[PDB]
């Protein structure tokens, strides 16, 4: 039907149908008479997978022969989502599969909905890793993603009586057709033990062994026949483990628990032993693989053939593990090993919130990884010797820069370790990289300014435009061709259509279709009833105080109170949608979810409001839900306190899909406004500098309560039980926090936020001008392609040249 989905040739369609029937019979062992939609999904997935295999084998063969520099992207999280559609898009098979399935009496869109998300991440960091893999393959880089195959990914969220409940995400129950187990490349990982010093150096002995078994998943590039590998490790006990008899076998679970479950803490550090085991497990297995591959061609050439990118500090143990292998096993002298390590490793920082920074207690490392602790101390002593030589007499600087933090509990600061041991350190948006140089890593920047870089984040336009919004992709392709899908800067050509009446109409029509489609999804799967002519005002992201879902709540109540005061005055109708998961132990985030649903309970059932205001909590926000709601959005809420959101990437997804943004000058919002023009963005609130000025005189929330009557009314409603008649004190923790210990200054941006929201509503009343502003946003979104981000990493950090060249088919 639509051009960007590729050709449906008679030969191809016939062959797909034949292979579908072959897999249904031989692979699934079903006849058509008892096959369910799920069986049909698997038969299609196996059919599409067969097309990846030849390309995967020959890509990996090509790397063995050409021996390019290899890029290893180490992450504890890869938030992949569904694979079927993405694979079809990247291999140009979507229309052919659509036709093949149609001729078999099946609806492919229905089959796609059966696939589970691969939910092996918490949110933005994990999803960035996934976008990056897609871009590295599309740019022809010899890149490998390395992580952990969690049996249970991010929990499924249920809402019961307005409260979040967690359920295990048993994503592997029905099998995963995309992975290939490679039990033949299983490797040992060591824990505990002790260090012996011989005349031949240190030996780490009496260790407990856990096996790391790899599972490989293909990562197809966009129409270039490149298929790279994501290798995920699973924990297995050795067969002599604990070897009365029955109990010894049952106790294998203690080893296998390492890969059982993803820690569900977005932007927060929990210093648990199991998490440290996960971190070392991924590092130790991965580094053995890296070294094996390097030896199958003298370590002076190691950094010319290997780059290791550390996705935050979570894999920071790679630095002392690489030193361990080089010094203890390969017998390099320390200085040579350190040179190799620093030239090989690079570190990306993703947060400045102090509670998110990894600081491991020394006693944990001492017990679990005694050789690594010795190596860390040695790194620290040598590093501080350089500091003292550069800044003689500056004793306070020595204390601030130490890898070892003093206190009642001594800790290792993993970010300091990463900076010391990496040739490049980057933040993830311009304002964030500047904050790193001015504040938390200022001392390090002064010692080694050359290390510090910026790499502004991006998103893949394959998943986040072509896949999730084919209607928009198509109307763009009609005007400017298909080349923009792998060169997103070409969207700039759309600025020459901003006064074209037909284009304006088509852009608005696509949005309307997406809104209708989403409104129907809501009715069918969640029995809820929304007005699709209303402005769709959407805030979807993990629940956190810094992201200020609470500021949104205050605006919603303000609108409700204004309607109740003047019910017969016209207001632009809104559907306010808020969704996101709270970490299970984060009490305040769970209370925020409850507040949102409680506001909905009052607003949605007030007959005076009518369909002018609806408040919906979107349950179980995840990648597959993002693909549905983002194309349907009119207004994107990006309202973190200035200085707290390192980048954001949801922001970019909404820009690409024809929503306007209301936001603070935080993270990548700054660069988005710069690209589109500030006049095409709804900017409000304190800048970073304003937050600092407030912190210096002291934030007093009472001042705002005293001066703003509308705000006082809301706080009185919350306090007195207006939104919780059965439990009048239910929200007292929220009120107490806002009034007395709000680190994120919600009240300080309230007035400017409400005023800015009034300007949004005013513009929405003029659909032609709303749509013209949308075109100006979509047209300038090109910078936010992860292809751009990855080309910068490749050239400025890894030392490799990207390529758009096709491999042979
Ligand atoms: O222990 N843990 O399970 C985690 C700890 C920290 C994070 C994290 N830091 N920054 C981001 C996000 O990274 C994203 C990608 O750079 C940014 O866009 C966003 O601003 C930032 O908040 N996540 C995740 C998990
Ligand atoms: O000794 C060899 N002979 C031929 N091909 C090899 C050899 N070793 C590795 N390869 C190729 O590279 C491999 C890719 O897997 P890797 O060993 O995980 O990098 C195989 O799939 C082969 O295509
Ligand atoms: C993009 C995305 C995120 C990140 O959104 P932010 O608004 O940048 O925090 C989180 N979760 C999911 C499922 C995503 O697709």
Curated annotation (Swiss-Prot):
Name recorded for this polypeptide: Glycogen phosphorylase, muscle form
NCBIfam families per the UniProt record, alphabetical: P_ylase
UniProt GO BP: glycogen catabolic process
PROSITE patterns (alphabetical): PHOSPHORYLASE
Cofactor(s) for this UniProt protein: pyridoxal 5'-phosphate
UniProt key word Glycosyltransferase: yes
Residues the UniProt record annotates as site (Can be labeled by an AMP analog): 144
Regulation: Allosterically regulated through the non-covalent binding of metabolites, being activated by AMP and inhibited by ATP, ADP, and glucose-6-phosphate. The activity is also controlled by post-translational modifications including phosphorylation.
CDD domains in alphabetical order: GT35_Glycogen_Phosphorylase
Any GO CC annotation of this UniProt entry: skeletal muscle myofibril
Family the UniProt entry places it in: Belongs to the glycogen phosphorylase family.
Subunit comment: Homodimer. Homotetramer; to form the enzymatically active phosphorylase A.
Modified residues (Phosphotyrosine): 192, 215, 445
């Amino acid at each position: 039907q639509i051009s960007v989905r590729g050709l449906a040739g008679v030969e191809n369609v016939t062959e797909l149908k034949k292979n579908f029937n072959r897999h249904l019979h031989f692979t699934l062992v079903k006849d058509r008479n008892v096959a369910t939609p799920r069986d049909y999904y698997f038969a299609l997935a196996h059919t599409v997978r067969d097309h990846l295999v030849g390309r995967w084998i020959r890509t990996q063969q090509h790397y063995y022969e050409k021996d390019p520099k290899r890029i290893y992207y180490l992450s504890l999280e890869f938030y992949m989502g569904r694979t079927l559609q993405n694979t079809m898009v990247n291999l140009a098979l979507e229309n052919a599969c659509d036709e093949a399935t149609y001729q078999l009496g099946l609806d492919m869109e229905e089959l796609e909905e059966i696939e589970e998300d691969a939910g092996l991440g918490n949110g933005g960091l994990g999803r960035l890793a996934a976008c990056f893999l897609d871009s590295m393959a599309t740019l022809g880089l010899a890149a490998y993603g390395y992580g952990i195959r969690y049996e249970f990914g991010i929990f499924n969220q249920k809402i019961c009586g307005g409260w979040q409940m967690e359920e295990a995400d048993d994503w592997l129950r029905y099998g995963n057709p995309w992975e290939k187990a490679r039990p033949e490349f299983t490797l040992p990982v060591h824990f505990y033990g002790r260090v012996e010093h011989t005349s031949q150096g240190a030996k780490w002995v009496d260790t407990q062994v856990v096996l790391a078994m790899p599972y490989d998943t293909p990562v197809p590039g966009y129409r270039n026949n490149v298929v790279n590998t994501m290798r995920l490790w699973s924990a297995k006990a050795p067969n002599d483990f604990n070897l009365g008899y029955i109990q010894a076998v049952l106790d294998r679970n203690l080893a296998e628990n390492i890969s059982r479950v993803l820690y569900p803490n977005d932007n927060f550090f929990e210093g648990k032993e199991l998490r440290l085991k996960q971190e070392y497990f991924v590092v130790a297995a991965t580094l053995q693989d890296i070294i094996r591959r390097f030896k199958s061609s003298n370590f002076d050439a190691f950094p010319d053939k290997v780059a290791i990118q550390l996705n935050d500090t979570h894999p920071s143990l790679a630095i002392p593990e690489l030193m361990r292998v080089l010094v203890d096993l390969e017998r390099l002298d320390w200085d040579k090993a350190w040179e190799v390590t620093v030239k090989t490793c690079a570190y990306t920082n993703h947060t400045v919130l102090p509670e998110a920074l990894e600081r491991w207690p020394v006693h944990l490392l001492e017990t679990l990884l005694p050789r690594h602790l010795q190596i860390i101390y040695e790194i620290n002593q040598r590093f501080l010797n350089r500091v003292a030589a550069a800044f003689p007499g500056d004793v306070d600087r020595l204390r601030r820069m130490s890898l070892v933090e003093e206190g009642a509990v001594k800790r290792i600061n993993m970010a300091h370790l990463c900076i010391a041991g990496s040739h490049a350190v980057n933040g993830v948006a311009r304002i964030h990289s500047e904050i790193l140089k001015k504040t938390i890593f200022k001392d390090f920047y002064e010692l080694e300014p050359h290390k510090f870089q910026n790499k502004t984040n991006g998103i893949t336009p394959r998943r986040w435009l072509v896949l999730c919004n084919p209607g928009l992709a198509e109307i763009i392709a009609e005007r400017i061709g298909e080349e923009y899908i792998s060169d997103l800067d070409q969207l700039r050509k759309l600025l020459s259509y901003v006064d074209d009446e037909a284009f304006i109409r088509d852009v608005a029509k696509v949005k309307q279709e997406n809104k209708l489609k989403f409104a129907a999804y809501l009715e069918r799967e969640y029995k809820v009833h929304i007005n699709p002519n209303s402005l769709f005002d959407v805030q979807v992201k993990r629940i956190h105080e810094y992201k200020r879902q609470l500021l949104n709540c205050l605006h919603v109540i303000t609108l409700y109170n204004r309607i109740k005061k003047e019910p017969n005055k016209f207001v632009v109708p809104r559907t306010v949608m808020i969704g996101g998961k709270a970490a299970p132990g984060y009490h305040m985030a769970k209370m925020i979810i409850k507040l949102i649903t409680a506001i909905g309970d009052v607003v949605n059932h007030d007959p005076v409001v009518g369909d002018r205001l609806r408040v919906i909590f979107l349950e179980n926000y995840r990648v597959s839900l993002a693909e549905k709601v983002i194309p349907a959005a009119d207004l994107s809420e990006q309202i973190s306190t200035a200085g707290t959101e390192a980048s954001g990437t949801g922001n970019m997804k909404f820009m690409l899909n024809g929503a306007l943004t209301i936001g603070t000058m935080d993270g990548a919002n700054v660069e988005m406004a710069e690209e589109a023009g500030e006049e095409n963005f709804f900017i409000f609130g304190m800048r970073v500098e304003d937050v600092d000025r407030l912190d210096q005189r002291g934030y007093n929330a009472q001042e705002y309560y005293d001066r703003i009557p509308e705000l006082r009314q809301i706080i009185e409603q919350l306090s007195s039980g207006f939104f919780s008649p059965k439990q009048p004190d239910l929200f007292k923790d929220i009120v107490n926090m806002l009034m007395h210990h709000d680190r994120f200054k919600v009240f300080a941006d309230y007035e400017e936020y409400v005023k800015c929201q009034e300007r949004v509503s005013a513009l929405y009343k003029n659909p032609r001008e709303w749509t013209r502003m949308v075109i100006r946003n979509i047209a300038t979104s090109g910078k936010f392609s992860s292809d751009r981000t990855i080309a910068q990493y490749a050239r400025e950090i890894w030392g490799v040249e990207p390529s758009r060249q096709r491999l042979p088919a």
